[PDB]
């Protein structure tokens, strides 16, 4: 059976094709010790990966090998793939075809080097690099729709109709979960909670996931926070200290719809989706309006689907039927689609094989992969 | 008064300033918001020409591009009681605004301007033209009670938590 | 003296009739501050026009009031025209009749509004709205020929024979420099370069103008770029970073001949020119083949004329003599022609006057102007 | 006339708008008597503020009401402000508008309570809270520049281009004086000198201001200190004992460029300034690479400007011209800017008045001040 | 050999460990430093692919990220005379290092590794690979005897301190 590794800016989702869920979901991090040790027999490992890095983060400097969907540290990404194959899946990668995923409009070198590492360093019999939005539509089971994929690094729209992608209508926005984490760190300083430094980004990410939500009406929510104090919620740090967060619960995700508040000129995710649909042929827009598929962790905010429905409705003509599809498992939909795709009989001829690789080199990935 | 008047939807979204610029210490909230509403009230070309010319006179008089004209109208409306024609023109335009197909989005923009740029800081003493526009967008007039604000100090749930860096140079 | 204002999508070319070149050439852009505050006396100016907006680019959001030869923001277009008259030409418009231009097959409200503004806002004594391809043919000295005009917003060709236009043969493609600019910043992401803001779009436009060229044979140029580094050119960004581009140099202009690059179904400019000629009477085609005249910035790519020569020669019968005329003053041919037209003594009776406007209104433009 | 800027963690700087320097500095200190009281005449007051708290440091427990830019003791702070008005400036605060300062990204309660004390317990007619880096740029005469302010509790970067701040690019490190001072007394221990809390911390601070300097090349300076005696210098303690200090006097401010000396994970002040740039628009960075404005007491180390010049010249494209602006009155630039700002006629509308305060309450400060 | 080889500016800065960690009991200075150099020698994607593929292979052989290969190379370099190709390849790699656009920062990092982590503790007996890399960064080779460590025992200025350093002992 084939392996499906959805690398992701923030998480590795890895598993075997045909399964309904990935076996291993761990942070896409490599941590290096900051301090002096200092005992004999302690700290002979120079680095920690994944869950081990997260557990020991107190004395580690954490670094994401992938940023904005682009692998920026290939040495540390090789560690994460070795950890995925050998420690998490416990498979010999020489035996399994490996399906990888990446965002659209990535640098071409990103997928060439992915191919090279898989064939040369890990010696996989074959591999494939798929587009995450296409995998998400596979997971949904639709053949039509515009996927809004928002993970930790990248938010991208891919409109698909009858199985045909309209690549000129693909929108990419380098504003995703990690950007929201940084903004939450910034607005948490308005109260006394000055993380202000790289130690606790991982824990304010947890505050973000636990407490943040999307306000259906931003002005109403702001007035409610200013007046009532019923929106206040508390969070307990690992130290046991309790922080209270009020309107920051919905101001942090509001950045998705107002890329300002972080100095970005781009339109919000609602208007990007609408712009994507309006770049499509007039005759497919109605089916796109009714098949807005959301995937990725950054679409897991409470109320984001309802906010998207209201926002796209306000942009589209009134006779159109806007429908947001937000499966409960949309956090793994990209991996689910990869599992579906990799297990299809018709896909078995699409794999890039080792023979084709060493005959053509890494540039083979551009021919055989979208 | 105006039948067959249509607007290009979303034409005004490009005109909305960034929220950060709304905080500028020299941001002209009244002129910028009136510019947004003026753009939203631009008749669609599908509107019949006699109506387009008719309404364009109304919005050009009430929402002129020129600052000199806008400041001239601002003074004349300060004693609006002696300008029954402006009363009628402004009432006609307020009726157009309240029937605008995208009034809900316009109200959100008006609320953002008040929240962010201090558009309605004068509350009840907001000038006649701006007040009618805000009344057209916000029918009940609740905007006259300025935005509710957070008031961070003396909050029930805020205490001096010490983070990893705050602990390096703590004091007691 | 009469003012000539070639109000293109990208640039304003304005000046006085009878001069050989426009006096004021500046971007057709209005920029507004998108950042905050924060110093007393430094923000009273909202909106910047033209060159000043381009210089303060880094803190502004830039918006073109004209898109695809159509004025979409009439308030900003008034600012552009007020800047042209009072700040760039330093004239009182009420003393000068004004000749301005537009693309063929524009919406008719576009002419009516620009007539309205000129008579009612600028109080011009008289005005005229000419077709840009016709003005280009004036500038070429000819009275026969098929002009291919391609600027920032739209590319159109107008076949003229013995001074007679064949309007049923006018062609329009909403594919011009701005579409090529957008495509280049799309394919620049392949090399890891991300340009997303309006300012960055301006710098990408600068890269296009300096480094892009039309390949005589696209496939051979792709093979050359793939096999060697001979076609790579470097470019220094305003912050000192240096980007290098290889086949993007000619893949961007290739969109003119292969509009499917940006998802358009339309035929290339070569095929559009041939289709325009074939829509003409069989008797005039021979003269049109020999008098293909280029105008506009988008025809300034190196090798564009040679590529057009080759492409049209492949479509026409072998016994025809295809000649592309590409004057070095291509970029201003439209303004030059309008300067010629407005100064001809036989044109002084074709002006729309303030009195005719009063009697008839804005619709006078449809009767008096092609 | 108006009273002008200070909220300094280490020093108060009070004076009148329009003057070229503060009329009274004195340290931001409140000392309480310890281990005394037997004699009737040896001090009646329970606390001493600023000057004469330094004099009595031997019998007092000195503590700063402001730590890392945040005022943490509102009882002692009101004493310092009362001392500032009545004992140093010899003025009644109820008849002078008062301009105060704040580091960016401070807790918002800090500003709200500052404006509350001014209006309620000092009954000022009007007030204002400015950002210290903005005032530094005012003092420097620039409308453009990235100002690296660093006092006794906070070092922060504010990039401003044309009076427009880019708030998303504000950087703040809680690493300034009072961490170099605390590191220095840790580092003096290995030489043989202890310097336990408070009064001896003030002693150590005094020796830092006199003997510390930034090595242009740290490794070479360390080697020189190891192989020579030329870098050794001596300092005389209040009780007459003389201490000799060698490499400790450039390792102490080396913490600014290598914060891991004190266990911090953040990047050095050179990298943080560079990171503040590269978050600004690419079209602004060249102007920011020049106009690198120094401010605050912690920028007064000899050779810090030249080391920042060197460090930022690295990390940057070689074509960029790095220029560090370090005026001799660095230490008072913030106050100098406040005096300039509070004197401008155009600023007289920017004051928050008692009228606005009692209509809106403390939160008015947020919608009136950057 | 490698015409047009280019590197990403500052790519290696995140690879430099904390100075505190450099003092760790089981810190492996050599592998950590060669990792920094390996990251610094990662070719920029601007580099043409045929050049990129050629140098990528060179640094794979001489600066492998795999620990098993690094040790195997180290043992294989004990008899560097018996590997003419390896001697020449490190000569090629050494030439690339000395032409690195950020050689000054790499050497400054190399010196920090020496002073803090004891990278050059073996002085002249340093491994062939590590020594040739250090030579590339520091041409004169002074690193073999440059790590001048300060000494505190028996140096001038040492004396007892009391009173204003607490520890009051006026009974002596
Ligand atoms: N329940 C949640 N609510 C809000 N955000 C979430 C939630 N779960 C995950 N996220 C965010 O989604 C991101 C991870 O999403 P994921 O789809 O794994 O992205 P990637 O594919 O890049 O790993 C994280 O940055 C995290 O903060
Ligand atoms: N030397 C050049 N090479 C390629 N393209 C160019 C060149 N100069 C200008 N352009 C393109 O031409 C457009 C401007 O042409 P212009 O005729 O001024 O159009 P308009 O009349 O709409 O202003 C710009 O979008 C620019 O990208
Ligand atoms: N010449 C100097 N050398 C080293 N440190 C200095 C020097 N001058 C002032 N300082 C330090 O700078 C700090 C004062 O800077 P300042 O801008 O007043 O900070 P604040 O605004 O917090 O009072 C003090 O802690 C002082 O020790
Ligand atoms: Mg994902
Ligand atoms: Mg043109
Ligand atoms: Mg200060």
UniProtKB/Swiss-Prot annotation, chains A, C, D:
GO MF entry, a single one: ATP binding
PTM (free text): Oxidation of Met-39 and Met-42 by MICALs (MICAL1, MICAL2 or MICAL3) to form methionine sulfoxide promotes actin filament depolymerization. MICAL1 and MICAL2 produce the (R)-S-oxide form. The (R)-S-oxide form is reverted by MSRB1 and MSRB2, which promotes actin repolymerization.
Leading EC class: hydrolase
Modified residues (N6-methyllysine): 79
Modified residues (Tele-methylhistidine): 68
Localisation per UniProt entry: Cytoplasm, Cytoskeleton
Gene Ontology cellular component list: actin cytoskeleton; actin filament; stress fiber; striated muscle thin filament
Record bears the keyword Cell membrane: no
Entry-linked Pfam families: Actin (PF00022)
Alphabetized InterPro entries for the sequence: Actin, Actin/actin-like_CS, Actin_CS, ATPase_NBD
Residues annotated with Methionine (R)-sulfoxide modification: 39, 42
Keyword terms, alphabetized: Acetylation, ATP-binding, Cytoplasm, Cytoskeleton, Hydrolase, Methylation, Muscle protein, Nucleotide-binding, Oxidation
Gene Ontology terms: biological process: skeletal muscle fiber development; skeletal muscle thin filament assembly
Catalysed reaction, written as an equation: ATP + H2O = ADP + phosphate + H(+)
E.C. designation(s): 3.6.4.-
Assigned protein family: Belongs to the actin family.
Something else known: In vertebrates 3 main groups of actin isoforms, alpha, beta and gamma have been identified. The alpha actins are found in muscle tissues and are a major constituent of the contractile apparatus. The beta and gamma actins coexist in most cell types as components of the cytoskeleton and as mediators of internal cell motility.
Subunit structure: Polymerization of globular actin (G-actin) leads to a structural filament (F-actin) in the form of a two-stranded helix. Each actin can bind to 4 others.
Role played: Actins are highly conserved proteins that are involved in various types of cell motility and are ubiquitously expressed in all eukaryotic cells.
Protein name in UniProt: Actin, alpha skeletal muscle
Organism expressing this protein natively: Gallus gallus (Chicken)
Gene coding for it: ACTA1
Swiss-Prot record, chains B, E:
Region: Actin-binding and polymerization, residue numbers: 1-156
Keywords assigned by UniProt, alphabetized: Actin-binding, Secreted, Virulence
GO terms for MF: actin binding
A GO cellular component entry from the record: extracellular region
Cell location: Secreted
Chief site of localization: secreted
Coiled-coil boundaries: none
Superkingdom: Bacteria
Family the entry assigns: Belongs to the SipA/IpaA family.
Physiological role: Actin-binding protein that interferes with host cell actin cytoskeleton. It stimulates actin polymerization and counteracts F-actin destabilizing proteins. Potentiates SipC activity; both are required for an efficient bacterial internalization.
The name this protein goes by in its record: Cell invasion protein SipA
Source organism phylogeny: Bacteria, Pseudomonadati, Pseudomonadota, Gammaproteobacteria, Enterobacterales
This protein's encoding gene: sipA
């Amino acid at each position: 059976t084939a392996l499906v590794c959805d690398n992701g800016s923030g998480l590795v989702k890895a598993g075997f094709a045909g399964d309904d869920a990935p076996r291993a979901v761990f942070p896409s991090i490599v941590g290096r010790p900051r301090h002096q040790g200092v005992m004999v027999g302690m700290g002979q490992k120079d680095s920690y990966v994944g869950d081990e890095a997260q557990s020991k983060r107190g004395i580690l400097t954490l670094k994401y090998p992938i940023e904005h969907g682009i692998i920026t540290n290939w040495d540390d990404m090789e560690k994460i793939w070795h950890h995925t194959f050998y420690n998490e899946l416990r498979v010999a990668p020489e035996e399994h075809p490996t399906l990888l995923t990446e965002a659209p409009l990535n640098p071409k070198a990103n997928r060439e080097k992915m191919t090279q590492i898989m064939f040369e360093t890990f010696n996989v019999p074959a591999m494939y690099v798929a587009i995450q939005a296409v995998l998400s539509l596979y997971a949904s089971g639709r053949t039509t729709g515009i996927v809004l994929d928002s993970g930790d690094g990248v938010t991208h729209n891919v409109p698909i109709y009858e199985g045909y992608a309209l690549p000129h209508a693909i929108m990419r926005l380098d504003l995703a979960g990690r950007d929201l984490t940084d903004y939450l760190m910034k607005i948490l300083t308005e109260r006394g909670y000055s993380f202000v430094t790289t130690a606790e980004r991982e824990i304010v990410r947890d505050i973000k996931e636990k407490l943040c939500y999307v306000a259906l009406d931003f002005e109403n929510e702001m007035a409610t926070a200013a007046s009532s104090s019923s929106l206040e919620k508390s969070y307990e740090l690992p130290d046991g200290q309790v922080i209270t967060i009020g309107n920051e619960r919905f101001r942090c995700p509001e950045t998705l719809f107002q890329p300002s508040f972080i100095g970005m000129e781009s339109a919000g995710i609602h208007e990007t989706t609408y712009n994507s649909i309006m770049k499509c042929d007039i005759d497919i827009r109605k089916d796109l309006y009714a098949n807005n598929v959301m995937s990725g962790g950054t679409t897991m905010y409470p109320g984001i689907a309802d906010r998207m429905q209201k926002e796209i409705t306000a942009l589209a003509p009134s006779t159109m039927k806007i429908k947001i599809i937000a499966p409960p498992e949309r956090k793994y939909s990209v991996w689910i689609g990869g599992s579906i795709l990799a297990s299809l009989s018709t896909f078995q001829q699409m794999w890039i094989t080792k023979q084709e690789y060493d005959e053509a080199g890494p540039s083979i990935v551009h021919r055989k992969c979208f | 008064p105006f039948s067959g008047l249509k607007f290009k939807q979303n034409s005004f979204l490009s005109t909305v300033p960034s929220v950060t610029n709304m905080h500028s210490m020299h941001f002209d909230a009244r002129e910028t918001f009136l510019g947004v509403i003026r753009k939203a009230l631009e008749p669609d070309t599908s509107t019949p020409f006699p109506v387009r010319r008719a309404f364009d006179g109304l919005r050009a008089e009430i929402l002129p591009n020129d600052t000199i004209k806008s400041a001239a109208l601002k003074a004349q409306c300060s004693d609006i009681d002696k300008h029954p024609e402006l009363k009628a023109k402004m009432e006609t335009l307020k009726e157009v605004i309240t029937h605008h197909p995208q009034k809900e989005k316009l109200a959100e923009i008006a609320l953002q301007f008040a929240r962010e740029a201090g558009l309605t800081r004068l509350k009840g003493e907001t000038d006649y033209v701006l007040s009618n526009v805000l009344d057209g967008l916000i029918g009940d007039g609740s905007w006259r009670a300025g935005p509710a604000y957070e008031s961070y100090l003396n909050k029930p749930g805020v205490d001096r938590v010490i983070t990893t860096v705050d602990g390096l140079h703590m004091q007691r």
